[model samples]
Structure formats: structure tokens, C-alpha cells
Target: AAQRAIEVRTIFHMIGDVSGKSVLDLACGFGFFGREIYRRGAAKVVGVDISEKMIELAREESRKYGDPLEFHVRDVANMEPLGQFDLVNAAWLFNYADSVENLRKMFKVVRASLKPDGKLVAYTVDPDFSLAKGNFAKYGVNVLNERAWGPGYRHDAEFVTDPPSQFSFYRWSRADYESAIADAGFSHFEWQKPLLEADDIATHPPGFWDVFQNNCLQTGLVCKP
Candidate 1:
């Protein structure tokens, strides 16, 4: 909860105002962010995820509000472009790519689904994340068995949830991420550090977020095509 709060707050700040914009959210687990985008005045918000169950849940959740959000179940790397969007939010999407080739494919689709002047905002594994240097468990996640694989690294992680869940992901260097974006035709890109709200800091003990801030497990980026 604490970790996600920062992630959401930071990404929303990076995205700025969405009034009248069309948004595409890749790997939108339960459409949580998508609904929020719509509520924030996005003209249209479409969510795509590889999991059928997740898509179902997203639809079910949106049904209650009668929000015109669209949910689709498809692997992002191969999903057809629904339409050119003003903004694409790909939170936690690139880490799913097990190989550099797959990463490039994901970027290709992102580029294809975006308008010429569109921007992509994504949250991904931090290139500098080091298990030895940080204790992520304090933030409700535990990363394990990280090792070099091919041109990057891979690791298993467990989230502290009602029913604890485990998953694995690949982490590429910053250079690799930039290269993929460039290869996919993005002309400009910049990484943004996460932000914590003043209220959150005031509610927690001093220095509670120091370690996490210094060695964030994930980072965000924005790209323009």
C-alpha cells in the first residue's frame, strides 16, 4: 500500500492533466488507474491486460460506475492497436519481457498505438536496483534470486497481499530501455524520480522512506514519438 501510493502519485504527477485526452493503459490489472483517468476527465480510457480474469474484473468494476472504459485481454507485445492515443500508460509492462527481443516488440506496439505527438509514461524495474544494497521487504515486497540473464537480469518477487503472491520479472539497464525506445522510433525520453506527498511523509516516521527512495525497485519514464 505504501509503495503503491508513491507509485500512483508520482505517475499521475508525471502525466499532468488528462482533460480531453485519450489514454491507453497497458497491463492494467483491475482498471484502477484507468477508471481514475476517466474520472480525471480523459475523453476515453482503454485498458489492456494479458489476463482474462483481470480484464473481467476490470469490466465488472467499471460497470458499477457506467464509465465508458474499455477493457481487453491481450498480450501487450502482440495486441493490435485499438487506436492512436494521446497518452499511453504502460505501468509495469516492460518488466514482463523476458528477453530484449520481447522488450523491443513491446516498444514497437507502444509506438504503433501512439499518435505522432503522443507520449508514453511507463513504470519499470529500476536499472540500479540491488538486493544487497536495499531491503525492499520494508515496503511490502521481497525480491529474491536475482541473477544475470542474457543482456540483463531476472528476479523473483513476492508481494505482501491478503493472499501472498509471487512473480518474476526481467530488469534491463537504462541503456537497454533507451535503446528499445529509440529503436521503436521515439525521438525523446527522460526518466523521472518518484515523489512522495507531504501528507504521506508527515504520517510516517522520519527516514522511513530513505532507503526506498535511495534504492527504488522501480522507476518511471516518459517518451515522445
Candidate 2:
């Protein structure tokens, strides 16, 4: 809940108004962002995920809510562009690239799917994040066994949920991301910090978010093609 509160709020702020805009959400797990974008008055919203099960769930949930969102099961690295969009949301996308070449490919796909003036809002693991900092349980995640791999690093993460979900992702340095974005022909790129809403701060204990604020594990990026 802590992570979701900050992530959703921060990403939504970066997203701003979507009225009448067409949006494409890459790696959109279960259509969470896509549904929200549609609800926010976007004219069109398409969600793409590599997992078939995830897409199934997304479709089912969209039906349940009577949301006319579109979803597809395809890998971002290899899928063809569906159409040019006003905005592209790629939450937790780039970190899945196991290599810089693959990362560039993913960016290329994003570029192809975007209009000339379109913007991309994405979330990624912070390059400076280190497991040695301390336990991230307070933030509802625990990263373990981080080790250097090529130009980046790899780590396993477990969410503090009922079933204790686990996953791993590659983390590339800021320079590497910049190089990939440049190579993919993006004109501008800026890193944004997560925002903790006033209500959340007021509701939680005074020092509850101190460690997360000081050493956040994730970061947001806004880019132009």
C-alpha cells in the first residue's frame, strides 16, 4: 500500500491531464494504469503485456468494470507498433532489459509507437539503489543478493504481500539509460522524484517514511521522442 500510494500518485502527477488524448501503456500489468487513464477521460487507452495470464486478467477486469480499454499480449522488445499515441506509459519497463542492446530495442518500439510530439512517462529501479542500505520492508519490498552484472546490476525482490510475490530485474546506470534514449532518438529526458502526498504524511507516523525518502529504490523518467 505504501509503494502503491506513492507510485500511483507520482506517476499520475507526471501524467497530468489526459482528456481526449490517446495513450499506450507498455508492460501494463493487469491494465491498472490503462483503466485509470481511460477513467481520466483519455479518448483511447491500449495496454500491452508479455504475460498471457496478465492480459486475461486485464480483459476480465475491464469487462467487469465496463471499461472499454484494449489489451494485447505481446513482448515490448519484439512487438510491432500498434499506432502513434499522444502519450506512452511504461511503468517498470526498461528495467526488464537484460542487455543494453535489448534496452535500445525496447526504446525503439516505444519511439515507433509515439507521435512526434508524444511524451513517455516511465518508472525504473533507481541506479543508486543498494541492498546494503537497509531493509525495505517498510516500503513493502525486500531486495536481496544484489550483484554487479556487466554495466549494471541484478537483484531479487520480494513484495510483502499475503502470498509474498517475488521477482528480479536488471538495473542499469543513469548513463546507460541516457545512452539508450539518445540512441533511440529521443530529444529530451528528465528524471523525476517520487512524491509523497500530504495526506499520506499526515496519516502515517512522523518518521515512518524517513528511510524511503532518504533512499528511495525507484525513480520516474519523462521523455520526448
Candidate 3:
């Protein structure tokens, strides 16, 4: 539940008051957000992910709820229009795109999935750092560019998982993210950087809070169509 306490909680509060609203969760990742939204009384929750295995596993775990949460395996970038939603969420999703063209396509789908008054919320690793050379080594993040096929950074993420698992994501520029989001017909963009509470910070190492705040590992954004 660490993710729920940290990232998901922020998203939940940002997309506040979801009672009776429809939500589209891109890269839903095991239906965590879907169940959370359902528990909060969302009218309908649809989730999409590229991994069929994940969808199947999510289905198995979520069958007990009997809520309106559904999971489908598909590339969100190429998805056909589903029902319009009051809120569209993409957590740690867009960084998979290595180019502006790909990001534009993804945002276009995000735009199409939204109601006219809908809002899209996205979360991703901040792209302002160089994967090839950074203090990430101390944090156990290792850059693995030997097999990457694009212009962005590719590295292994070790923080969220035990024993340091491998993960890769594109390093998108601020200009690129903003440009794609704006060109895709979204307006009124808002940005946020969530931080641990002061009491929580007291439990970590002396420099932990400093590194966390300075590195700015995660970001939150809200946009409207």
C-alpha cells in the first residue's frame, strides 16, 4: 500500500469528488486505481494496459468486487474511442514514448477519451536529468542505454520494488511534454510536485528529503479539453 499512500493518494485528491463520474485509467496497472475509484463511487471505470498478462491477473484479483471496473489489453496510443469520461488518468504511462510524434499520438487518444468538459491527469518521472551520468547510482537506478532505440533516457527503476527490479522509460523534455499536451487540444495545464510530509520526512536519512525534493522524482499534471 506504499503506492496508494504516496502516488495514488495524490491522484485521488487531484481528481477529487468522483462520485457518479466516469473515469478512464490508461495504464491502469493491476486495477489498483480502478478499484480505488470504484470504492469511491465512480459510475464507471475502464482501464487499459499493453500487457495481456497484467489484464488477466487484474481480472482475477478484481472479480470479487462486481463493480463496473473493466480491464482490456490494448495499446492506449492506438485505441479507438471508448465512451467519453469525466476524468482520464495516465500514471507513469507517457514516458514510454521516445519521440514527440509518439507523445502526440498518445495525447490525441487521451483527448479523444475525454468528455468536452473532461480533465486529464498524468504522472511521470521528471525528464530533466541525464540517465547516462547522474547521482542515480547511489539510489540504485542504473542506466541501460545499450538496447534503447530512441532519443530519451532508458534506465532501471529500483525504488518501488523490492530487491531492485528493472524498468525502462523515456526521458521527455518539458518543452516536448507541454508542446504535445497543448497541440493535442488540451488547455489550462496545471503542474504539481508532491512531497512527503514533515513528520514522514523525519523517519528517513538526514539527506533523504533533500535528495527527494531536489531530484523531484515524480510529477503531477492536470489538463482540460
RMSD of each: 1.3, 1.2, 2.8
* Clash-forming residue pairs, model 2: none
**Alpha carbon deviation, residue 140, candidate 1 (Å):** 2.1
lDDT of 1 at 40: 93
Question: Candidate 1 lDDT, tens digit per residue, 1-225?
Answer: 578988998789888999999999999999988789889999999999999999999999998888999999999888776889999998999999988889999999999999998999998889999888876877888886789999999899889887878999998988888899999999999998888667877889999988888888979899999
- Give the per-residue lDDT digits (tens) of candidate 2, residues 1-225: 478879998899989999999999999989999899999999999999999999999999999999999999999999966999999999998999998888889988988998998999998888877777766778888787788889899888889888989999998988989988998889999998898777878999998887787778889999998
Q: List the global CA lDDT of all models.
A: 0.90, 0.89, 0.76
Better of 1 and 3 by TM-score: 1
Greater TM-score among 2 and 3 belongs to 2
Tell me how many clashing residue pairs each candidate has: 0, 0, 0
Tens digits of per-residue lDDT, candidate 3, 43-91, equal 9889898899988877877876666688889888788777789999888
| Candidate 3 ranges with C-alpha deviation above 4 Å | 1-4, 130-151, 159-163
Of the candidates shown, which would achieve the greatest TM-score relative to the real structure?
2
TM-score of each model, paired residue for residue? 0.95, 0.96, 0.87
User: Where does candidate 2 have its weakest 10-residue lDDT segment?
Assistant: 128-137
In candidate 1, position 134 carries an lDDT of 79
Cand. 1 TM to true fold: 0.95
Candidate 2 matches the true fold with a TM-score of 0.96
